[PDB]
Design a protein around this nucleic acid. Structure first.
Length: 270
DNA sequence: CGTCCAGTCTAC
DNA sequence: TAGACCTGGACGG
């Protein structure tokens, strides 16, 4: 997922778990090389928030829950196939690698972190990744200042299409979003990052870094993805103007990732 | 059957 | 930097 997917996943956990009570331990698949979550409670609520391409779960025991336990926070990154689902306990999807189980009363459901390719990761801390910049969705003004303060950084030597993936400055921006963002401004993907950014110091490249992914969120649905029908997925394919679309050029950036664009590749093209 | 394609993380 | 980390769907023979 990218920021919209991480953001919509957090909204999903919050709405789906609002009137649910979990109990017991936090179960991990045998094959997952991520850490065992040391946590047990007779009764606890799960909530979420999203920051860029990371999602924080808070496991929050109720008054009187046993064993005695302070709230616990997990941060997740999704890599290529991470996701959250609420399923019936005996119908776990195949790659459900971490699982929170409802307590009686009611239907026994499982909140599952599902990650086919297992590029996703979680940490016990609860801290955001040091070095990741502010959320382009929820921290726009902080994100905007963080780029304009640091144009001197060597990151901005690189072509614009590569800089937009550097999560130190564009936390939340991934492959589809960089294509869609540059297509909106007809900015060649291999223009130099510093060149396009120095200008700003209406809608400019940094503003679109916020407004474009906000468009994905306001589709409702589950971004690139279909957790709420194939209808929501068709809604997304329709929103796209550039990424994967017929009549568009594509190249490889210096890290082998496909950038989609119209017309001028730009000066720093391979 | 085979190939190729879809975000970090870490060892050169 | 370049390869490593993974599974599965869409192709081509």
């Amino acid at each position: 997922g990218q920021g919209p997917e991480l953001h919509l996943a957090s909204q999903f956990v919050n709405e789906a778990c609002r009137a649910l009570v979990f109990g017991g331990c936090v179960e991990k698949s045998s094959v997952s090389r991520n850490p065992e979550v040391p946590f047990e409670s007779s009764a606890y609520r799960i909530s979420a928030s999203a920051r860029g391409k990371e999602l924080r779960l808070i496991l929050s025991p109720l008054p009187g829950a046993q064993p005695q336990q302070e709230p616990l926070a997990l941060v997740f990154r999704f890599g290529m196939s991470g996701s959250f689902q609420l399923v019936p306990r005996e119908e776990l999807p195949r790659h459900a690698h971490l699982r929170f189980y409802t307590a009686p009363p009611g239907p026994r459901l499982a909140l599952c972190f599902v990650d086919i390719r297992r590029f996703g990761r979680w940490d016990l801390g609860g801290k955001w990744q040091p070095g990741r910049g502010p959320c382009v969705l929820q921290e726009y003004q902080q994100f905007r200042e963080n780029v304009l303060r640091n144009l001197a950084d060597k990151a901005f030597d690189r072509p614009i299409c590569e800089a937009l993936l550097d999560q130190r400055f564009f936390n939340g921006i991934g492959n589809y979003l960089r294509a869609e963002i540059l297509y909106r401004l007809k900015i060649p993907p291999f223009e130099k990052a510093r060149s396009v950014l120095e200008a700003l110091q209406n809608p400019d490249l940094l503003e679109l870094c916020h407004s474009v992914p906000k468009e994905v969120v306001q589709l409702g649905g589950r971004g690139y993805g279909s957790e709420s029908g194939e209808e929501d997925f068709a809604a997304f394919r329709a929103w796209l103007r550039c990424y994967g679309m017929p009549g568009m050029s594509s190249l490889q950036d210096r890290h082998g990732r496909t950038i989609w664009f119209q017309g001028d590749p730009g000066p720093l093209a391979p």
